[PDB]
């Protein structure tokens, strides 16, 4: 059970991830999206923890947690982070590490606080040694994800300042497993004129389902292990850019869609494999209000080093999302020709997905799959 303060920050993080998604969805350079709301909110908590004055005040405003004390934000986000750690093998790996220049030293109090509240590690690298800098970052994320995330980025954009790197691996464990041999090769339609071959897993069972004939989209709910969380997939009827769906994706509309669902025989076919997405949230967080933290001339990150040396150059959000057949073994579904003519949820074109905690309703994941890999 979450404390009422951590529960309020859970809805604060979910709202922040929504705006992050919409902001990145407008970016024609962004393809797949993968955001963990508690990890995003943790980035603003680190800027507030290691900053003062407007630099720390803006980070709290982007989180919309102005009516809460600073130590309430760190403690609340700290409880939220540890709540997800207590629900692993679904398999969930997380690493957070700050990278600063060699000319700068980290203040001991900030190292103690960031490690206690956000599990944040600290490292110094020579950004001008581009090869050694990337290797130090990529090898740390690969070690954190046990090779599932072999590399974060191929280029460091600003050779002065701080890089906040988050490396994550998530593997949904279904409450009802897929058959490990129910996989074959299918064509995934990135567009109507672009088809890439992928592996697809198929299961037919009883799922919460709603067909929106008005706005032309499908919604299915896939419960995770022991129904402690759920994976919701939204897919338009036609092969089209998700921009039309993203204008309907709101907190209010999602609830309306959840209430119209009903348990029906549904044949679910999803791409199978590991999706690797790396985001640089730094410029998008600035567009939400985190302006001073990224300005090399105005940033106040003095709590990080003691004498105002650093500025937020990058906030790396790197995730490896594995779709797999593994799940819980379910007893017979023998009292259920129910699955003889099931509704087809044939996900061979881009879709929006999110992971919701069943107990609190807090957003564990939000993203989309527009271009898989095979």
């Amino acid at each position: 059970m979450l404390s009422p303060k951590a529960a309020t920050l859970a809805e604060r993080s979910a709202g922040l991830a929504f705006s992050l998604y919409q902001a990145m969805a407008k970016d024609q350079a962004v393809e797949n999206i993968l955001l963990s709301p508690v990890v995003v909110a943790s980035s603003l908590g680190l800027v507030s923890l290691g900053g003062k004055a407007t630099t720390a005040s803006q980070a709290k405003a982007v989180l919309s947690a102005e009516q809460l004390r600073d130590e309430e934000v760190h403690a609340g986000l700290g409880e939220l982070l540890r709540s997800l750690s207590n629900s692993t093998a679904v398999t969930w790996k997380l690493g957070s590490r700050l990278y600063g220049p060699s000319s700068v030293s980290f203040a001991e109090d900030f190292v103690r606080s960031s490690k206690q509240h956000y599990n944040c590690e600290h490292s110094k690298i020579n950004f001008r040694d581009k090869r050694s800098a990337l290797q130090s970052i990529n090898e740390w994320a690969a070690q954190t994800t046990d090779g599932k995330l072999p590399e974060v980025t191929k280029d460091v954009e600003r050779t002065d300042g701080a890089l906040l790197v988050n490396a994550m691996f998530f593997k949904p464990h279904w409450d009802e497993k897929f058959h490990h041999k129910m996989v074959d090769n299918r064509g995934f339609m990135v567009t109507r004129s672009y088809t890439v071959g992928v592996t697809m897993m198929h299961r037919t069972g009883l799922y919460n389902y709603y067909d929106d004939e008005k706005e032309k989209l499908q919604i299915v709910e896939m419960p995770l292990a022991h129904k402690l969380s759920s994976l919701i997939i939204l897919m338009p009827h036609h092969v089209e850019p998700l921009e039309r769906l993203e204008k309907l994706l709101t907190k209010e509309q999602l609830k309306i869609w959840m209430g119209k669902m009903q348990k029906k025989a549904v044949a679910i076919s999803l791409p199978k494999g590991v999706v690797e997405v790396t985001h640089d949230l730094q410029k998008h967080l600035a567009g939400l209000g985190l302006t001073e933290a990224i300005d090399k001339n105005k940033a106040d990150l003095s709590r990080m080093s003691g004498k105002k040396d650093l500025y937020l150059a990058s906030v790396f959000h790197a995730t490896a999302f594995e779709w797999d057949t593994e799940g819980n073994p379910f007893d017979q579904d023998i009292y259920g020709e129910e699955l003889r003519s099931p509704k087809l949820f044939y996900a061979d074109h881009p879709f929006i997905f999110l992971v919701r905690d069943t107990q609190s309703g807090s957003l564990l994941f939000i993203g989309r799959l527009v271009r898989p890999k095979g």
């Binding site: 036609h238 092969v239 044949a267 003889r340 087809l344 044939y346």
Partner: peptide, 21 residues
């Protein structure tokens, strides 16, 4: 013993628009 065949697949995409007159 292999199980029965699966259900029919989804209907194909609508055709592209015709050429100009």
């Amino acid at each position: 013993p292999p199980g029965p065949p699966g259900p029919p697949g989804p209907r194909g995409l609508p055709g592209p628009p015709g050429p100009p007159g």
